[PDB]
Design a protein around this ligand. Structure first.
Ligand SMILES: O=C(Nc1ccc(I)cc1)N1CCC(n2c(=O)[nH]c3c(Br)cccc32)CC1
Length: 314
């Protein structure tokens, strides 16, 4: 079985109405939200959504989707149900045009970046995948996070399918990551101190917080409650808790502050603390600065600027 292109198997592609103004796969899938997507052919992005492999590509007005099923069933277009899982993952019910207008109307620098970086949306990620991917993100570059997440899934996620050279795994279950061998094994895969954070956080969610049920509860809770609750987990500080809140728990006002948002603040917003250096208090101020500027979807605005900085550094 090989990776499909819109050309190589036209009958196996289904279409979502979706202009490039609303979504640019090339500016979203490698922009450090999800670490699971690869451009395996020019303009074709392959990765795992909900334990199935997809390839996505786009024309001017359409998002084209194809799904590989690891069963013995005949190949077929995505069902309307499967298509809806893609629509929710890209949060296409949120119209980017109105947000881009608001952010540009209050912020000249954003206006400037936004011209070049259209269609940068926030993915709605699975909370487990989002939590453990960003535990892997601490003191780490995008290349090394992608590698660490890839090795974690290979080791502890179910094998789905092989396409050309690439073997795809689902994201590990809590049960898999709570296992007794996990920590040692993750240290062998170069996760370092993060190996223990993964094991201990999987055990803390299963044993103390009542499993997956908890992350659904946080999804339905306030930003303030969700952020506080996440911060009890080993390896989850303010930055990682904000990433999870923004990317998996529907808190669009979350502004994850680390060195990267500091660099944008100083370089592009001539910003200083009101200790001149990254601390809890100065990190909190910076987050409040961008919520005050951009409004209730501040974290979506940040995603645009992060997409730009990531692209313009390789
Ligand atoms: O912080 C995130 N992701 C993230 C994406 C969107 C939102 I909103 C919030 C966080 N992580 C993945 C990207 C990673 N990173 C680099 O390695 N270089 C970066 C540059 Br240049 C600039 C911004 C991040 C960078 C840091 C860890």
């Amino acid at each position: 079985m090989g990776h499909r292109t819109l050309a190589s198997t036209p009958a196996l592609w289904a279409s979502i109405p979706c202009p490039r103004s609303e979504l640019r796969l090339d500016l979203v899938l490698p922009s450090g939200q999800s670490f699971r997507w690869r451009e395996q052919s020019p303009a074709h992005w392959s990765g795992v959504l909900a334990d199935q492999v997809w390839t996505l590509t786009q024309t001017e007005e359409q998002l084209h989707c194809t799904v590989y099923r690891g069963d013995k069933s005949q190949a077929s277009r995505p069902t309307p149900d499967e298509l809806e899982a893609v629509r929710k993952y890209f949060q296409l019910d949120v119209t980017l045009a109105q947000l881009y207008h608001h952010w540009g109307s209050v912020d000249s620098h954003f206006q400037e970046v936004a011209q070049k970086f259209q269609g940068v949306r926030l993915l709605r990620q699975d909370p487990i995948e989002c939590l453990f991917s960003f535990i892997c993100s601490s003191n780490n570059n995008i290349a090394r996070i992608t590698g660490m997440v890839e090795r974690l899934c290979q080791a502890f996620g179910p094998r789905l399918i092989q396409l050309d050279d690439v073997t795809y795994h689902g994201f590990p279950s809590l049960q898999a990551l709570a296992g007794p061998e996990v920590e040692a094994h993750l240290r062998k895969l170069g996760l370092g101190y993060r190996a223990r954070y993964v094991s201990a956080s999987a055990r803390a969610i299963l044993e103390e917080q009542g499993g997956l049920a908890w992350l659904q509860q946080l999804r339905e809770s306030s930003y303030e409650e969700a952020h506080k609750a996440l911060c009890i987990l080993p390896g989850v500080g303010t930055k990682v808790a904000d990433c999870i809140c923004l990317m998996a728990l529907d808190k669009p006002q979350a502004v994850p502050v680390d060195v990267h948002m500091w660099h944008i603040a100083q370089r592009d917003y001539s910003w200083h603390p009101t200790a001149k250096g990254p601390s809890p208090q100065t990190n909190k101020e910076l987050g409040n600065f961008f919520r005050s500027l951009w409004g209730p979807y501040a974290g979506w605005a940040q995603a645009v600027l992060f997409s730009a900085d990531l692209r313009q550094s390789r």
